[PDB]
């Protein structure tokens with residue numbers, strides 16, 4: 001209901017409640033391929049930023065899996081974007097980059113974790129968000145871990161439900 005702060009207009013295409021369709025696709029050189037369901041809620045309350053919650057679930061049992069939440073800020077009147085996330089693995093990250101048209105490309109510069117986080121530890125993350133020609137939201141996530149160089153981990157497209 002609050003009018004949207006002009007600072008976040010360059011990312012207005014991300015706003016909504018979204019559901020992975022088809023299921024998200026998970027991979028890594030060390031992992032068997034997997035699928036997952038994900039609910040994405042991207043919202044705002046009038047501040048110069050977006051609020052997000054991304055919650056994934058097992059496609060069959062619907063048991064909760066990865067979860068994260070945070071904020072997406074922009075430098076006013078620019079296309080420069082900064083993303084902060086806390087993840088249920090006990091990991092936090094700061095990613096920055098830019099939006100051009102309806103594509104956002106960001107990369108981590110800072111990652112920290114809890115002392116008992118499960119190994120292997122992630123060292124670098126990059127994400128690409130885009131709105132495709134059908135009006136669906138796409139996210140692709142890549143990462144490097146202590147033992148694996150930068151490569152794709154996740155790809156998902158979402159249907160807006162709300």
Ligand code: HEM
Nearest residue numbers: 026028030031034036056065066120121122125141143145
């Ligand atoms: C930016 C967000 C994420 C990061 C940084 C991240 C990081 C990682 C890392 C470091 C690993 C271990 C890699 C290895 O075993 O070599 C992993 C594994 C895994 N992740 Fe992700 N992850 C993310 C998002 C997700 C999401 C959304 C899902 C959806 C369910 C997911 C599901 C899994 C699964 C199933 C595994 C392997 C579990 C196993 O070892 O059996 N992750 N992730």
